């Protein structure tokens, strides 16, 4: 499991979400943030299984790019364990 | 130390905070977020730094308190932490 | 590659940002959060998220430790998180170093 943290432009969020959904990546959490490369941005936090890391990264790279300074970055973090609250079971 | 990141239903936050307190967990950071499991739903994100020996009990406290049994309950991620510093004193870990 | 997460007092943000800028650390993301410490009811804090290369970990941590301190309970903490890889969206460049 990996946790992907991506920072994108607010005006590209809808496009990014659509790309993610099409890539079959539906579990995600987002929030409004401010950043410096202060400007308003959107932060996506996505926990994915190993096979979904690239698909997720690519969905965002392609959908969030505008070619102008401020497009954002994508961090891939290691995750030791993940638990599903509904069942109280690990992974 | 490890960093616990839990996404729970807003209506379960109080129960979770109470269980964490009973489990001797005091240090925590939280914020409001939106999530998908097209339509985004309001959730609350808790971020808790906890030392190895007590990660399990802390996770268990959250799991028990945040569950409803219905889809939408959320998840708990346990991330490794390379180093932790206390800003008040500057001390490592 | 590391992701530094620092939680500081809102009244110390400007100082912190200045120290980071001076240390040549410009890339960062921040948001407002509510927190409780191991010692005293939540209080508002500013959470900074800073992705840095290995050589910039010490300088970044040092800059925050200097600027955000007051010596009183509530000062906050700094978490240095391991990062497997980082991608720049505009250039498509990836870092792992
Ligand atoms: N190092 C970082 N750590 C945390 N967040 C960052 C970092 N760099 C950028 N961000 C986030 O991404 C947003 C856009 O930065 P971007 O990566 O687009 O900056 P640039 O200056 O356009 O690119 P670069 O910094 O790679 O030259 C920033 O406003 C911030 O929200
Ligand atoms: N993989 C994920 N990455 C990041 N956040 C997630 C992920 N999965 C779920 N979440 C967060 O938890 C919230 C609730 O998820 P939900 O409980 O709907 O997960 P499911 O896997 O879709 O259903 P369930 O896990 O309950 O069987 C989501 O709205 C989101 O905020
Ligand atoms: N273990 C933790 N996990 C997540 N967030 C924390 C943790 N400890 C502290 N915080 C964040 O830092 C803020 C200030 O903490 P404080 O500085 O009060 O820590 P303390 O350990 O409780 O006090 P001190 O570190 O100053 O002796 C808290 O309100 C919270 O936002």
């Amino acid at each position: 499991m990996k946790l992907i943290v991506a920072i994108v432009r607010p005006e590209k969020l809808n496009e990014v979400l659509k790309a993610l959904f099409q890539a079959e990546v539906r579990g995600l959490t987002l929030s409004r943030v401010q950043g410096h490369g202060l400007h308003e941005k959107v932060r996506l936090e996505i926990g994915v299984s190993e096979p979904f890391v690239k698909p997720t990264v690519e969905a965002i790279l392609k959908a969030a790019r505008t070619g102008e300074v401020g497009d954002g970055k994508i961090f891939v973090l290691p995750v030791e364990k993940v638990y599903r609250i509904r069942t109280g079971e690990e992974d």
Side-chain angles (χ1 to χ4, degrees), chain A:
Chain A
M1 191 72 35
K2 290 294 181 296
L3 188 65
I4 298 173
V5 180
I7 308 302
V8 306
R9 296 172 184 276
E11 66 274 16
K12 304 242 62 176
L13 173 63
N14 293 311
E15 181 170 348
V16 170
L17 293 176
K18 175 189 176 185
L20 285 172
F21 294 166
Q22 182 175 177
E24 297 182 57
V25 177
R26 287 109 181 182
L28 59 81
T29 297
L30 61 84
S31 62
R32 262 59 185 179
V33 299
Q34 299 186 67
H36 197 295
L38 300 176
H39 302 293
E40 295 182 0
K41 302 289 177 182
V42 173
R43 177 180 182 288
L44 296 72
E45 205 160 32
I46 313 171
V48 302
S49 62
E50 304 309 320
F52 277 86
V53 173
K54 288 64 61 242
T56 295
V57 170
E58 297 175 3
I60 302 171
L61 292 177
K62 297 151 58 179
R65 183 179 194 281
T66 71
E68 229 61 62
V69 170
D71 282 353
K73 291 194 179 63
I74 305 172
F75 302 89
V76 179
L77 316 187
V79 172
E80 308 196 320
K81 294 180 180 62
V82 180
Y83 301 81
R84 187 179 299 286
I85 297 179
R86 180 180 66 76
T87 59
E89 291 168 23
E90 193 210 304
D91 177 0

Short mmCIF file of all heavy atoms in Angstrom, two decimals, chain A residues 41-78:
data_model
loop_
_atom_site.label_atom_id
_atom_site.label_comp_id
_atom_site.label_asym_id
_atom_site.label_seq_id
_atom_site.Cartn_x
_atom_site.Cartn_y
_atom_site.Cartn_z
N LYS A 41 -4.90 26.00 -3.59
CA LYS A 41 -4.69 24.74 -4.30
C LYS A 41 -5.58 23.68 -3.66
O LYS A 41 -6.22 23.93 -2.63
CB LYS A 41 -3.23 24.28 -4.20
CG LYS A 41 -2.18 25.26 -4.71
CD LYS A 41 -2.21 25.37 -6.23
CE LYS A 41 -1.20 26.41 -6.72
NZ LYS A 41 -1.25 26.55 -8.20
N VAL A 42 -5.62 22.50 -4.27
CA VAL A 42 -6.40 21.38 -3.73
C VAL A 42 -5.44 20.22 -3.48
O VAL A 42 -4.62 19.88 -4.34
CB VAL A 42 -7.50 20.91 -4.70
CG1 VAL A 42 -8.16 19.65 -4.16
CG2 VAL A 42 -8.55 22.01 -4.88
N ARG A 43 -5.54 19.63 -2.30
CA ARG A 43 -4.69 18.52 -1.91
C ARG A 43 -5.49 17.22 -1.91
O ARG A 43 -6.51 17.12 -1.24
CB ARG A 43 -4.11 18.78 -0.52
CG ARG A 43 -3.26 17.67 0.09
CD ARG A 43 -2.78 18.13 1.47
NE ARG A 43 -1.91 17.18 2.16
CZ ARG A 43 -2.31 16.02 2.69
NH1 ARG A 43 -3.59 15.66 2.61
NH2 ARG A 43 -1.44 15.25 3.33
N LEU A 44 -5.03 16.24 -2.69
CA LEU A 44 -5.69 14.94 -2.75
C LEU A 44 -4.82 13.96 -1.99
O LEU A 44 -3.59 13.99 -2.10
CB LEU A 44 -5.84 14.46 -4.21
CG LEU A 44 -6.72 15.30 -5.14
CD1 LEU A 44 -6.01 16.60 -5.46
CD2 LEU A 44 -7.00 14.54 -6.42
N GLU A 45 -5.45 13.10 -1.19
CA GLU A 45 -4.76 12.09 -0.40
C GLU A 45 -5.39 10.78 -0.85
O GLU A 45 -6.58 10.55 -0.59
CB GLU A 45 -5.02 12.32 1.09
CG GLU A 45 -3.96 11.77 2.02
CD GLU A 45 -4.01 12.43 3.39
OE1 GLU A 45 -5.11 12.80 3.84
OE2 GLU A 45 -2.94 12.57 4.02
N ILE A 46 -4.61 9.94 -1.51
CA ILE A 46 -5.13 8.69 -2.06
C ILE A 46 -4.36 7.45 -1.66
O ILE A 46 -3.19 7.30 -2.01
CB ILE A 46 -5.13 8.78 -3.61
CG1 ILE A 46 -5.74 10.12 -4.04
CG2 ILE A 46 -5.93 7.64 -4.20
CD1 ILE A 46 -5.60 10.41 -5.54
N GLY A 47 -5.01 6.55 -0.92
CA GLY A 47 -4.36 5.32 -0.52
C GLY A 47 -4.65 4.28 -1.59
O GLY A 47 -5.81 4.03 -1.90
N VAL A 48 -3.61 3.69 -2.16
CA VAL A 48 -3.80 2.69 -3.22
C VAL A 48 -2.91 1.46 -3.07
O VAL A 48 -1.85 1.52 -2.43
CB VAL A 48 -3.50 3.31 -4.61
CG1 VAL A 48 -4.39 4.51 -4.85
CG2 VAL A 48 -2.03 3.71 -4.70
N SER A 49 -3.34 0.35 -3.65
CA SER A 49 -2.55 -0.87 -3.61
C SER A 49 -1.40 -0.68 -4.59
O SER A 49 -1.47 0.20 -5.46
CB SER A 49 -3.40 -2.08 -4.03
OG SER A 49 -3.84 -1.93 -5.37
N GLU A 50 -0.36 -1.49 -4.47
CA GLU A 50 0.82 -1.36 -5.32
C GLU A 50 0.56 -1.22 -6.82
O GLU A 50 1.16 -0.37 -7.47
CB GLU A 50 1.78 -2.52 -5.09
CG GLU A 50 2.24 -2.71 -3.66
CD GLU A 50 2.78 -1.45 -3.03
OE1 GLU A 50 3.50 -0.69 -3.71
OE2 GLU A 50 2.49 -1.23 -1.83
N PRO A 51 -0.33 -2.06 -7.39
CA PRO A 51 -0.62 -1.98 -8.82
C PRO A 51 -1.29 -0.69 -9.26
O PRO A 51 -1.26 -0.34 -10.44
CB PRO A 51 -1.52 -3.19 -9.06
CG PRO A 51 -1.12 -4.15 -7.99
CD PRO A 51 -0.98 -3.24 -6.79
N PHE A 52 -1.90 0.03 -8.32
CA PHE A 52 -2.58 1.26 -8.67
C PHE A 52 -1.77 2.55 -8.53
O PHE A 52 -2.25 3.63 -8.86
CB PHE A 52 -3.89 1.40 -7.89
CG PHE A 52 -5.04 0.65 -8.50
CD1 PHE A 52 -5.24 -0.69 -8.22
CD2 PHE A 52 -5.89 1.29 -9.40
CE1 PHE A 52 -6.29 -1.40 -8.82
CE2 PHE A 52 -6.94 0.60 -10.00
CZ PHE A 52 -7.13 -0.75 -9.72
N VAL A 53 -0.53 2.44 -8.05
CA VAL A 53 0.29 3.63 -7.90
C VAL A 53 0.52 4.36 -9.23
O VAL A 53 0.19 5.54 -9.35
CB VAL A 53 1.67 3.31 -7.27
CG1 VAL A 53 2.56 4.54 -7.29
CG2 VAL A 53 1.48 2.84 -5.83
N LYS A 54 1.07 3.67 -10.22
CA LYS A 54 1.32 4.32 -11.51
C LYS A 54 0.03 4.83 -12.16
O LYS A 54 -0.02 5.98 -12.59
CB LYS A 54 2.05 3.38 -12.48
CG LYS A 54 3.51 3.15 -12.11
CD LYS A 54 3.64 2.45 -10.77
CE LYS A 54 2.98 1.08 -10.82
NZ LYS A 54 1.84 0.90 -9.88
N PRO A 55 -1.02 3.99 -12.23
CA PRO A 55 -2.27 4.45 -12.83
C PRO A 55 -2.76 5.75 -12.18
O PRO A 55 -3.26 6.64 -12.85
CB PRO A 55 -3.22 3.28 -12.56
CG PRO A 55 -2.32 2.11 -12.68
CD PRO A 55 -1.09 2.55 -11.91
N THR A 56 -2.61 5.83 -10.86
CA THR A 56 -3.03 7.02 -10.12
C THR A 56 -2.14 8.22 -10.44
O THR A 56 -2.62 9.32 -10.70
CB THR A 56 -3.00 6.76 -8.60
OG1 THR A 56 -3.97 5.76 -8.27
CG2 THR A 56 -3.30 8.03 -7.82
N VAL A 57 -0.83 7.99 -10.41
CA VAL A 57 0.12 9.05 -10.71
C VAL A 57 -0.10 9.59 -12.11
O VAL A 57 -0.14 10.80 -12.32
CB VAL A 57 1.58 8.56 -10.56
CG1 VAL A 57 2.54 9.60 -11.11
CG2 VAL A 57 1.88 8.29 -9.09
N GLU A 58 -0.26 8.69 -13.08
CA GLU A 58 -0.46 9.08 -14.47
C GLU A 58 -1.78 9.83 -14.69
O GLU A 58 -1.82 10.81 -15.44
CB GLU A 58 -0.37 7.85 -15.38
CG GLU A 58 1.02 7.21 -15.33
CD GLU A 58 1.14 5.91 -16.11
OE1 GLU A 58 0.15 5.51 -16.76
OE2 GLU A 58 2.22 5.30 -16.08
N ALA A 59 -2.84 9.40 -14.03
CA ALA A 59 -4.13 10.06 -14.17
C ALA A 59 -3.99 11.53 -13.78
O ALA A 59 -4.50 12.41 -14.47
CB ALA A 59 -5.17 9.38 -13.28
N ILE A 60 -3.29 11.78 -12.68
CA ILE A 60 -3.09 13.13 -12.18
C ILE A 60 -2.11 13.93 -13.03
O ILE A 60 -2.36 15.10 -13.34
CB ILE A 60 -2.58 13.11 -10.71
CG1 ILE A 60 -3.58 12.35 -9.82
CG2 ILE A 60 -2.39 14.53 -10.19
CD1 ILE A 60 -3.07 12.07 -8.41
N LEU A 61 -0.99 13.33 -13.41
CA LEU A 61 -0.01 14.04 -14.24
C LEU A 61 -0.66 14.57 -15.50
O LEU A 61 -0.47 15.73 -15.87
CB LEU A 61 1.14 13.12 -14.65
CG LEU A 61 2.09 12.66 -13.55
CD1 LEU A 61 3.11 11.70 -14.12
CD2 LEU A 61 2.77 13.88 -12.94
N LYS A 62 -1.42 13.71 -16.17
CA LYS A 62 -2.06 14.09 -17.43
C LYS A 62 -3.21 15.09 -17.29
O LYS A 62 -3.29 16.06 -18.05
CB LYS A 62 -2.55 12.84 -18.16
CG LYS A 62 -1.42 11.90 -18.55
CD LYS A 62 -1.86 10.44 -18.59
CE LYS A 62 -3.01 10.21 -19.56
NZ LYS A 62 -3.40 8.76 -19.60
N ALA A 63 -4.07 14.88 -16.31
CA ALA A 63 -5.22 15.75 -16.11
C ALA A 63 -4.94 17.10 -15.44
O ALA A 63 -5.64 18.07 -15.69
CB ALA A 63 -6.29 15.01 -15.32
N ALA A 64 -3.91 17.16 -14.59
CA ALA A 64 -3.63 18.41 -13.88
C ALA A 64 -2.65 19.37 -14.54
O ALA A 64 -2.53 20.52 -14.11
CB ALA A 64 -3.14 18.08 -12.47
N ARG A 65 -1.95 18.92 -15.57
CA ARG A 65 -0.97 19.78 -16.23
C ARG A 65 -1.59 20.87 -17.09
O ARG A 65 -2.55 20.63 -17.81
CB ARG A 65 -0.03 18.95 -17.11
CG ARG A 65 1.06 19.79 -17.77
CD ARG A 65 2.01 18.95 -18.61
NE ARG A 65 3.22 19.70 -18.96
CZ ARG A 65 3.29 20.62 -19.92
NH1 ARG A 65 2.23 20.91 -20.66
NH2 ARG A 65 4.44 21.26 -20.14
N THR A 66 -1.02 22.08 -17.00
CA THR A 66 -1.45 23.22 -17.81
C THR A 66 -0.23 23.72 -18.56
O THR A 66 -0.34 24.37 -19.60
CB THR A 66 -1.99 24.38 -16.95
OG1 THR A 66 -0.91 25.01 -16.26
CG2 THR A 66 -3.02 23.89 -15.95
N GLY A 67 0.96 23.41 -18.03
CA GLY A 67 2.19 23.84 -18.66
C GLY A 67 2.73 25.14 -18.10
O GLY A 67 3.80 25.60 -18.49
N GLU A 68 2.00 25.73 -17.17
CA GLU A 68 2.40 26.98 -16.54
C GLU A 68 2.87 26.71 -15.12
O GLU A 68 2.48 25.71 -14.52
CB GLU A 68 1.21 27.95 -16.52
CG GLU A 68 1.52 29.34 -17.04
CD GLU A 68 1.97 29.34 -18.49
OE1 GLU A 68 1.18 28.92 -19.37
OE2 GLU A 68 3.12 29.75 -18.76
N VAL A 69 3.72 27.58 -14.59
CA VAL A 69 4.23 27.41 -13.23
C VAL A 69 3.06 27.36 -12.25
O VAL A 69 2.14 28.18 -12.33
CB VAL A 69 5.18 28.58 -12.84
CG1 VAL A 69 5.51 28.53 -11.36
CG2 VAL A 69 6.46 28.49 -13.66
N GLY A 70 3.10 26.38 -11.34
CA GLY A 70 2.04 26.24 -10.36
C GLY A 70 1.18 25.00 -10.51
O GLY A 70 0.21 24.82 -9.78
N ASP A 71 1.53 24.13 -11.46
CA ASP A 71 0.75 22.91 -11.70
C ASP A 71 0.69 21.93 -10.53
O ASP A 71 -0.29 21.20 -10.38
CB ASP A 71 1.27 22.18 -12.94
CG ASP A 71 0.82 22.83 -14.24
OD1 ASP A 71 -0.01 23.76 -14.20
OD2 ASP A 71 1.29 22.38 -15.31
N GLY A 72 1.74 21.90 -9.72
CA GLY A 72 1.73 21.01 -8.57
C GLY A 72 2.74 19.88 -8.56
O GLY A 72 3.57 19.73 -9.46
N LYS A 73 2.65 19.06 -7.52
CA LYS A 73 3.54 17.92 -7.37
C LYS A 73 2.78 16.74 -6.79
O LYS A 73 1.70 16.90 -6.22
CB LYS A 73 4.71 18.27 -6.45
CG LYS A 73 5.70 19.28 -7.05
CD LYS A 73 6.99 19.32 -6.24
CE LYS A 73 8.00 20.30 -6.82
NZ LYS A 73 7.49 21.70 -6.78
N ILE A 74 3.35 15.55 -6.96
CA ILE A 74 2.75 14.32 -6.47
C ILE A 74 3.76 13.55 -5.61
O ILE A 74 4.82 13.16 -6.10
CB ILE A 74 2.34 13.39 -7.64
CG1 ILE A 74 1.43 14.13 -8.61
CG2 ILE A 74 1.63 12.15 -7.10
CD1 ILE A 74 1.14 13.35 -9.90
N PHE A 75 3.42 13.34 -4.34
CA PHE A 75 4.30 12.60 -3.44
C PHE A 75 3.76 11.19 -3.23
O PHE A 75 2.56 11.01 -3.04
CB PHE A 75 4.40 13.30 -2.07
CG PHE A 75 4.89 14.71 -2.14
CD1 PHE A 75 4.00 15.77 -2.30
CD2 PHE A 75 6.25 15.00 -2.05
CE1 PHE A 75 4.46 17.09 -2.36
CE2 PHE A 75 6.72 16.31 -2.12
CZ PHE A 75 5.81 17.35 -2.27
N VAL A 76 4.65 10.21 -3.27
CA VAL A 76 4.26 8.82 -3.05
C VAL A 76 4.92 8.38 -1.74
O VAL A 76 6.15 8.29 -1.65
CB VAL A 76 4.73 7.91 -4.20
CG1 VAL A 76 4.34 6.46 -3.92
CG2 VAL A 76 4.10 8.38 -5.52
N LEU A 77 4.10 8.12 -0.73
CA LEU A 77 4.60 7.74 0.58
C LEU A 77 4.35 6.29 0.94
O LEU A 77 3.32 5.73 0.58
CB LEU A 77 3.94 8.59 1.67
CG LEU A 77 3.80 10.10 1.43
CD1 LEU A 77 3.28 10.76 2.70
CD2 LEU A 77 5.12 10.69 1.03
N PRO A 78 5.29 5.67 1.66
CA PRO A 78 5.11 4.27 2.06
C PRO A 78 4.06 4.24 3.18
O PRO A 78 3.93 5.20 3.95
CB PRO A 78 6.50 3.87 2.56
CG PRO A 78 7.04 5.17 3.10
CD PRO A 78 6.63 6.15 2.02
#
